[PDB]
């Protein structure tokens, strides 16, 4: 269900082109004639409002925005009951006869597991996890448990529900912790970091994506280079510049990945320009980054403007370490900013204690604040040193 999830994701916010939502809408109507996508489109209008929420024919009666092409016509309306008879009335009667004839054990479990995948395309989630629970008691080895954790993971992928799905994803590994091969051991930890990207835990969850996407891909939902853009942007985002030379710019998979398609423009254009300390050509590569990468990708657009605040402070911080004092004519008259427009970027970063820099408003001499031998031994020691008696007397003064 990645095709309808990735392409129709442009229905959230697209400020670039109008045909982006139109071209992606063709894949929605093409894939829905085979398998039922109806519960996916119903949630699109129930998530974001006053943008695309008025395009549904029957939810409430509304017409708005630019898109008349996403809807259920009189054909799919009559096909709504046709798919329900095949996915419920037809399948449940065949499995019910298996319990009466008592044929096999794991074969009956795989029947409920395969049937449980149809409930994801139905839109009733109470019977989705119920059928998986019936096959849970019939599951013996780890072969039948592979598709169980995949169907449960689709509940948060297909319905975009990060609340009730993460409880079931953790319940499988917590009740019985085995993992089998290290391939699945990374799968239980991958789904853990997916729901943490919705709450935006930053480098905690995002550090596992660059490791998993550079080794193995499920290959069933998508391809290797389609979701590779998630690890390309978060690669330089989470990892410091010191380790970018031994990891990102030199990699067996990444250097062969840029030759597959030009839609990345991260591990190549942004990495080489950042390692060369040249910000003249580095910034125009960011112009095609957010547009052609962050917006179309799902988990990347969940952040969007959350990337730059961490990245914009870091790109200048690395330049301040290479010189004691810089010049305003280098920043204002050359690369990324003008004179007056510089106050908007570094103006809000310093009061947040993100970086320490000094700009001269007369002679135009940029000055860098260097802690020298102070560092965390003196100043930062006082800050985090007060937490010793703060956390001790918090619950300690009340005894029991």
């Amino acid at each position: 269900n990645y095709e309808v999830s990735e392409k129709a994701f442009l229905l959230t916010q697209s400020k670039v082109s109008i045909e982006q939502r139109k071209e992606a809408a063709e894949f929605v109507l093409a894939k829905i004639k085979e398998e039922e996508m109806a519960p996916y489109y119903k949630y699109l209008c129930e998530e974001y409002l006053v943008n695309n929420g008025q395009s549904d024919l029957e939810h409430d009666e509304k017409s708005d925005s630019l898109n008349e092409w996403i809807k259920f016509d009189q054909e799919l309306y009559n096909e709504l009951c046709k798919k329900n008879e095949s996915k419920i009335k037809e399948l449940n009667e065949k499995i019910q006869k298996l319990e009466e004839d008592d044929e096999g054990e794991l074969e009956q479990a795989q029947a409920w597991i395969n049937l449980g995948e149809y409930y994801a395309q139905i839109g009733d989630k109470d019977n989705a996890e119920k059928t998986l629970g019936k096959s849970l008691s019939k599951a013996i080895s780890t072969g039948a448990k592979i598709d169980v954790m995949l169907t449960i993971a689709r509940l948060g992928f297909f319905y975009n529900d990060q609340l009730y799905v993460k409880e079931k994803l953790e319940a499988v590994n917590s009740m019985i912790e085995k993992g089998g091969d290290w391939e699945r051991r990374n799968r239980y930890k991958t789904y853990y970091g997916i729901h943490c990207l919705a709450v935006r835990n930053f480098k905690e969850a995002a550090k596992l994506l660059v490791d998993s996407l550079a080794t193995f891909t499920s290959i069933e939902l998508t391809s290797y280079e389609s979701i590779a853009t998630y690890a390309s942007v978060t690669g330089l985002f989470t990892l410091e510049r010191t380790d970018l030379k031994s990891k990102v710019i030199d990699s067996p998979e990444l250097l062969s990945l840029i030759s597959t398609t030009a839609a990345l423009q991260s591990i190549s254009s942004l990495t080489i320009s950042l390692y060369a300390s040249d910000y003249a050509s580095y910034f125009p590569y960011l112009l095609e980054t957010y547009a052609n990468v962050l917006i179309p990708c799902k988990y990347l657009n969940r952040h969007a403007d959350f990337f730059v605040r961490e990245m914009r402070r870091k790109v200048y911080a690395q330049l301040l370490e290479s010189y004691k004092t810089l010049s305003l004519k280098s920043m204002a008259s050359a690369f990324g900013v003008s004179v007056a427009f510089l106050d908007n970027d570094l103006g809000k970063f310093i009061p947040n204690k993100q970086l320490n820099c000094v700009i001269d408003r007369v002679n135009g001499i940029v000055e860098t604040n260097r802690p020298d031998n102070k560092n965390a031994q003196y100043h930062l020691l006082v800050k985090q040193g007060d937490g010793l008696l703060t956390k001790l007397q918090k619950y300690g003064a009340a005894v029991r």
Partner: peptide, 27 residues
């Protein structure tokens, strides 16, 4: 966690990247 959530506005990408286009044309 939640402090980073609200403090980020609609500014930056959609805005500052539109300024970088006209900035290089004036130089």
């Amino acid at each position: 966690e939640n402090w980073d959530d609200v403090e980020v506005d609609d500014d930056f990408t959609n805005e500052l990247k539109a300024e970088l286009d006209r900035y290089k044309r004036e130089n």
